[PDB]
Symmetry: none
Subunit: 92 residues, 2 copies
């Protein structure tokens, strides 16, 4: 029942997934160093094997007005978690 | 009929298709510079619309454990042929 933003947090919290996703700095910004792999592993986790990057991207973009996550303007495959929103949600 | 991985080698062997697919380096890595066009052409050849990159990419994944072709991890549309397997499968 896990949601996408949590799964990314799960991957980032585990230093070993740096092969495909990694922290950038310390203020909640991250980079998908292997975007196709992030989409494939999110596919495994949610039992949806036609998961691909286009669909992963569409889901990430959906969060833009939901105090979850926004896409970083200068960079490719970069997002920044909404610090206040993620903090708030990660309690209930 | 012809199989997907063969059709890709066919496109790669012909210098004029670099607009959509091209060899990268000399160890069997290649890049699809226009993935949608590669898919469109694979669509006509196997007389199979509505072929698109998503169905194509998923088909390529079949090869990853069959000593034909593997997907290059840092990248989006770059793949690498298995020389030994390609050699053996051909004869």
């Amino acid at each position: 029942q896990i949601q996408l933003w949590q799964f990314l947090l799960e991957l980032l919290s585990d230093s070993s997934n740096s092969s495909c996703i990694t922290w950038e700095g310390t203020n909640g910004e991250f980079k998908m160093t292997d975007p196709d792999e992030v989409a494939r592993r999110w596919g495994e986790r949610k039992s949806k094997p036609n998961m691909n990057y286009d669909k992963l991207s569409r889901a990430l973009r959906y969060y833009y007005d939901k105090n979850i996550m926004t896409k970083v303007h200068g960079k490719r495959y970069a997002y920044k978690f909404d610090f206040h929103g993620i903090a708030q949600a990660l309690q209930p």
